[PDB]
């Protein structure tokens, strides 16, 4: 019955597949078509055609493993896409049409139906599979009767009858929010359209509207740009992705139903884009510190994941108007064009998405200007993102506190992310591939960059924890200067350290004090563990003298500096130790498999060479202090360290501060309320984090109390001398 429901489904088909936009003469589209042709060909030649078959596909035969249901139905969706693509060799193919119909019936009779109960993961039963079934039926609605459609979607209503909750049939349902809430729309709104059920459509859309509300606690988007999911996990880059990616797909359809969403309600999406997503995108890469356990997926490295966000933004731009549309187009354009490592089209999986991107890139009317400098203090999720446009580098600071979980290990994914939030830092430079090409399965998980840890063995079976202290946070002064601290205690309460960071425009100072260890394990801070490029080798200098690193760790006592020299200055990394320090370095090939950190991944061996720099802490009360200076050549680095000779103001158990004389900026962390006199110019009076700038006789102050998550009146925390 061709009606308004089918009309909406046609629009949905144009969004999830886009066959109406296909053009064989379009190289990028032809590439995706060829991929789908191959997938269908593989599925058709391996499917079971035997009577009394115990499965459709032998590699997805054990139906007690929920993942096999979703994978099976997704193969049918691929078939539906091609059978309805005039340019496919499978267009209106009678064998494929019958294969999809027969397969749906077979699964319905022996594997997935209303009489079944969740076996394995609820996600496959309520989201993964229902979405694959909805899309298959939507694409091939001209081959199924309304009665068959309702028949094959009854199971969806059994497992997901309530648009406000998931796991309804289990003994522990949960309130649907964020990404999950968006998926609820792709499940019940589409099923509602297929079943011509107005009540399901309306109630689901109404439920979906909750997603536009910013929160001040719990899961969701925060005013400061943070995004929390799974109770207390920083998750903008994975569940946030699903949210914007899926919602941007749904909106065009929803807005054409009898229950469109108010325009002022959808206004918050622009806040997510500018405040939440944009800062986490550097040279086409979505910062891993925001991706949770997804970092352990080989097919979802940083640049790939970024496309999920970018395509979502582009769709939103397409449904926007005027300046709003123009600026969003420019944002997507400059990000994509800044990415010289990853081909955006590799993750644009529908013809409309491919088409939109091509028009954007070729439209001279859409400005593509390098993004300006910025610094986002995502205090509500304990992460900080910094980007310097003049020099061209990004910096990510990954922390956690009593308010957030350090790392997520679940569904057998991210088994070794133990220290990824223990004050771990990321540097985004000229090597756009650094955190890609197998970084995650080859990086030594015991030496994450920036972290202070003991060398005790850790179990893959462990799960995340919150930090005992709430004294973790960032005080931002402007787009280039901020200060952060973390009152760190390790996983088993055997080591402590007051770790602080001083972001000073074109460099970051790392200070650590009060380092104590009550265990028999050795303690050390990993200054860096950088993945190398065989094509661009580094020439290493210690105290400005070339050094030859080996697989075997070499000690360098009385080190004032270390410089990693590339042929490309935008890949250079220098480390200046305020006080001569005893460090050790090594360059070695590290091997591993994605399966080591994610059970469902390939056991194929991967290898990468890493340069590791560490500083041992053999005594209680130890400390570390150094300045990370990227993107400058050797002579310039040498000149800068002389300018910074006296930049360290203090680094003890109650006070840590660094001064940038060139900028007239101070970064300060106070652990108590004593009166601290700084540079004989002013005094800071309260426990907390400060970033201060002197402009003549004037003083600009940025104070933050991380525990109460509040700033304070200037006179309460600052006092100029005389």
Ligand X SMILES: CC(=O)N[C@@H]1[C@@H](O[C@@H]2OC(C(=O)O)=C[C@H](O)[C@H]2O)[C@@H](OS(=O)(=O)O)[C@@H](CO)O[C@H]1O
404 binds ligand X (CB under 6 A): no
What are the structure tokens assigned to 330, written together?
């420019």
What's the rounded Cα separation, in Å, for the pair 96 and 75? 11
Residue 242 within binding range of ligand X, rule CB under 6 A = yes
Minimum distance from residue 249 beta carbon to ligand X (Å): 10
Phi, psi for residue 511 in degrees, rounded to 5 = -125, 135
Of 545-604, binders to ligand X (CB under 6 A) are none
In degrees and rounded to multiples of 5, residue 683 shows phi and psi of -130, 140
Nearest CA to 633 out of 721, 539, 559, 553 is that of 539
Letters for 121-150 (x = contact with ligand X by CB under 6 A, - = none) are x-xx---x----------------------
d(CA 82, CA 89): 8
Strands of the sheet with 383-388, listed across from one edge? 374-378, 383-388, 393-398, 424-428
The contact mask relative to ligand X for 297-326 (x = CB under 6 A, - = no) is -----------x------------------
Determine the length of the chain. 722
Comparing CB distances to ligand X, the nearer of 381 and 480 is 381
**Cβ closest to ligand X, residue 137 vs residue 295:** 295
Distance CA 192, CA 258 (A): 13
What is the C-alpha separation between 285 and 234, in angstroms, rounded?
A: 17
Work out the angle between the directed axes of helices 94-110 and 146-159 (0-180°, nearest 10): 40
d(CA 491, CA 349): 41
* Residue 423-462 contact track with ligand X, rule CB under 6 A, x = bound: ----------------------------------------
Measured CA to CA, the distance from residue 483 to residue 472 in angstroms comes to 11
Nearer to ligand X, 383 or 447 (CB): 383
Query: Alpha-carbon distance 62 to 111, whole Å?
Result: 10
239 binds ligand X (CB under 6 A): yes
Single residue of 294, 475, 500, 514 touching ligand X by CB under 6 A: 294
Q: After which residues is the chain broken (C to N over 2.5 A)?
A: none
* Least distance from ligand X to the Cβ atom of residue 657, Å: 40
The Cα–Cα gap between 129 and 72 comes to 9
Q: How far apart, in whole angstroms, are the C-alpha atoms of residue 431 and residue 610? A: 14
CB of 245 to ligand X, least distance (A): 7
By beta carbon distance, the residue nearest ligand X is 123
- Could you tell me the smallest distance in angstroms from the CB atom of residue 244 to ligand X? 12
Q: Whose Cβ is closer to ligand X: residue 249's or residue 379's?
A: 249
State in angstroms the smallest separation of the CB of 343 from ligand X.
18
Segment lying near ligand X (by CB under 6 A), choices 117-125, 400-408, 633-641, 683-691:
117-125
H or E segment at 451? none
Question: To the nearest whole angstrom, how small is the minimum distance from the Cβ of residue 70 to ligand X?
Answer: 7
Pick the closer one to ligand X by CB: 173 or 664.
173
Number of residues that bind ligand X (CB under 6 A): 10
Instruction: State the sign of the Cα–Cα–Cα–Cα dihedral 227, 230, 233, 236.
Output: negative
**CA separation (Å) from 167 to 118, 173, 174, 218, 648?**
9, 4, 7, 19, 54
3-state secondary structure of 7: helix
Between residues 284 and 625, which has the closer beta carbon with respect to ligand X? 284
Angstrom distances, CA of residue 562 to CA of 538, 541, 618, 685: 12, 5, 22, 36
CB-wise, 158 or 349, nearer to ligand X?
349
Residues 532-551 vs ligand X: string with x where CB under 6 A?
--------------------
Q: Which is nearer to ligand X, 301 or 528 (CB)?
A: 301
CA atoms within 13 A on the CB side of 177: 17
Contacts of residue 147, Cβ cutoff 8 Å, sequence gap at least 6: none
Cβ at position 310, least distance to ligand X in Å? 13
Nearer to ligand X, 183 or 200 (CB): 183
Q: Is 576 helix (H, G, I), strand (E, B) or coil?
A: strand
C-beta of 180: minimal distance to ligand X in Å? 8
Structural contact between residues 364 and 429, judged by C-beta atoms closer than 8 angstroms: no
> Of residues 164-223, which lie at the interface with ligand X (CB under 6 A)?
179
Q: Which stretch binds ligand X (CB under 6 A): 238-246, 382-390, 401-409, 532-540?
A: 238-246
DSSP SS3 for 157? helix
Q: Which stretch binds ligand X (CB under 6 A): 116-124, 492-500, 538-546, 578-586?
A: 116-124
Which among 119-127, 421-429, 554-562, 681-689 is the span making contact with ligand X, rule CB under 6 A?
119-127
Closer Cβ to ligand X, 179 or 394, answer by number: 179
Give, for 21, the enclosing helix (H) or strand (E).
Answer: none
Stretch that binds ligand X, among 13-21, 83-91, 237-245, 338-346 (CB under 6 A): 237-245
Give the residue with the Cβ less far from ligand X, 185 or 450: 185
Looking at the Cβ atoms of 128 and 625, the one nearer to ligand X is 128
Nearest Cα to 505, choosing from 400, 603, 640, 600? 640
Q: Which window, 105-113, 120-128, 266-274, 648-656, contacts ligand X (CB under 6 A)?
A: 120-128
**Tokens 């880059």 map to which residue?**
237
Judged by beta carbon, residue 298 or residue 668, the one nearer ligand X is 298
Give buried/exposed letters for 653-674 (b at 16+ CB in 10 A, else e): ebbbbbbbeeeebbbbbbbeee
Q: How far is the CB of 179 from ligand X (least distance, A)?
A: 6
Least distance (Å) between residue 115 CB and ligand X: 22
3-state secondary structure of 19: helix
In the 8-state DSSP scheme, what is residue 180? H
Q: How far is the CB of 208 from ligand X (least distance, A)?
A: 17
Cβ closest to ligand X, residue 63 vs residue 123: 123
Residue pair 51/109 in contact (Cβ under 8 Å)? The answer is no
- CA angle at 440 for the pair 404 and 610, rounded to the nearest 5°: 120
Stretch of 27-35, 235-243, 608-616, 639-647 contacting ligand X, by CB under 6 A = 235-243
By beta-carbon proximity to ligand X, the closer residue of 179 and 192 is 179
Q: Which residue has the tokens 């200070």?
A: 511
Min separation Cβ 614 and ligand X, Å = 32
Given the rule CB under 6 A, which of 236-244, 498-506, 532-540, 610-618 is the region that contacts ligand X? 236-244
Q: Tell me which of 32, 191, 238, 644 binds ligand X, using CB under 6 A.
A: 238
Kindly tell me which of 128 and 192 has the beta carbon lying closer to ligand X.
128
Q: How far is the CB of 288 from ligand X (least distance, A)?
A: 13
Which chain residues interact with ligand X by CB under 6 A? 121, 123-124, 128, 179, 238-239, 242, 294, 308
């Amino acid at each position: 019955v061709k009606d308004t429901y089918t009309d909406r489904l046609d629009d949905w088909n144009g969004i999830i597949a886009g066959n109406q936009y296909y053009d064989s003469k379009n190289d990028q589209m032809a590439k995706l078509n060829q991929e789908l042709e191959g997938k269908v060909a593989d599925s058709l030649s391996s499917i079971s055609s035997q009577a009394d078959r115990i499965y459709l596909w032998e590699k997805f035969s054990n139906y007690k493993t929920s993942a096999n249901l979703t994978a099976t139905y997704r193969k049918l969706e691929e078939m539906a896409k091609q059978v309805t693509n005039p340019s496919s060799r499978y267009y209106q193919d009678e064998t494929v049409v019958r294969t999809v119909r027969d397969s749906m019936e077979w699964m319905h009779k022996h594997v997935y139906n209303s009489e079944k109960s969740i076996v394995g993961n609820w996600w496959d039963y309520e989201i993964g599979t229902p979405r694959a079934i909805n899309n298959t039926l939507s694409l091939m609605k001209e081959y199924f009767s309304d009665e068959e459609i309702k028949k094959y979607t009854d199971v969806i209503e059994k497992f997901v009858p309530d648009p406000e909750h998931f796991r309804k049939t289990t003994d522990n349902p949960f309130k649907a929010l964020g990404g999950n809430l968006v998926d609820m729309g792709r499940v019940k709104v589409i099923a509602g359209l297929l079943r011509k059920d107005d009540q399901e459509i309306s109630s689901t859309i109404r439920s979906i509207e909750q997603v536009f509300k910013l929160v001040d606690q719990g899961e969701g988007f925060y005013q400061d740009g943070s995004y929390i999911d799974h109770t207390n996990v920083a998750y903008t880059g994975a569940f946030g992705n699903v949210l914007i990616d899926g919602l941007s797909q749904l909106l065009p359809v929803i807005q054409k139903t009898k229950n469109p969403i108010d325009k002022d309600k959808m206004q918050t999406m622009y806040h997510w884009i500018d405040k939440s997503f944009a800062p986490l995108l550097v040279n086409g890469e979505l910062m891993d510190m925001s991706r949770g356990r997804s970092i352990s997926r080989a097919n979802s490295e940083g640049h790939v994941a970024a496309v999920e966000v970018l395509r979502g933004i582009h769709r939103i731009a397409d449904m926007s108007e005027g300046e709003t549309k123009q600026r969003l187009q420019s944002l997507v354009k400059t990000i994509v064009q800044s990415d010289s490592y990853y081909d955006v089209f590799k993750n644009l999986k529908t013809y409309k998405d491919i088409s939109l991107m091509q028009s954007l890139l070729s439209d001279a009317g859409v400005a593509s200007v390098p993004r300006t400098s910025y610094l986002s203090a995502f205090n509500k999720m304990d992460k900080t993102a910094m980007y310097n446009a003049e020099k061209g580098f990004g910096f990510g600071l990954s922390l956690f506190s009593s308010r957030t979980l350090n790392y997520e290990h679940m569904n057998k994914e991210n088994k070794r992310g133990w220290y990824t939030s223990d004050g771990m830092f990321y540097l985004y430079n000229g090597d756009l591939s650094h955190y890609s090409d197998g970084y995650w399965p080859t990086v030594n998980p015991y030496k994450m960059p920036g972290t202070t840890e003991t060398d005790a063995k850790r179990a893959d079976s462990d799960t995340g924890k919150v930090l005992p202290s709430a004294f973790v946070g960032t005080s931002k002064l402007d787009d280039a200067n901020a200060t952060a601290t973390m009152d760190f205690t390790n996983w088993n309460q055997t080591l402590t350290a007051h770790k602080s960071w001083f972001m000073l425009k074109d460099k970051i100072a790392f200070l650590g004090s009060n380092i104590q260890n009550t265990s028999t394990d050795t303690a050390a801070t990993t200054i860096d563990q950088r993945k190398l490029e065989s094509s661009n080798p580094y020439k290493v200098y210690v105290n400005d003298k070339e050094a030859s690193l080996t697989e075997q760790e070499k000690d360098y006592p009385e080190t004032q500096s270390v410089f990693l020299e590339s042929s490309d200055s935008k890949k250079n990394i220098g480390y200046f130790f305020f006080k001569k320090s005893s460090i050790s370095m090594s360059k070695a090939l590290q091997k591993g498999a994605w399966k080591d950190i994610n059970e469902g991944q390939s056991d194929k061996e991967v290898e990468n060479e890493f340069l590791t720099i560490s500083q041992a802490h053999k005594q209680n009360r130890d400390s570390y202090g150094y300045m990370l200076i990227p993107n400058v050549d050797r002579a310039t680095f040498n000149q800068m360290i002389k300018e910074l000779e006296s930049s360290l103001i203090e680094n003890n158990e109650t006070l840590q501060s660094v001064y940038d004389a060139k900028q007239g900026v101070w970064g300060i962390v106070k652990y108590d309320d004593s009166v601290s006199t700084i540079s004989n110019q002013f005094q800071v009076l309260k426990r907390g984090v400060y970033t201060i700038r002197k402009e003549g006789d004037e003083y600009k102050i940025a104070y933050y109390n991380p525990e109460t998550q509040e700033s304070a009146p200037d006179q309460e925390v600052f006092k100029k001398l005389e």
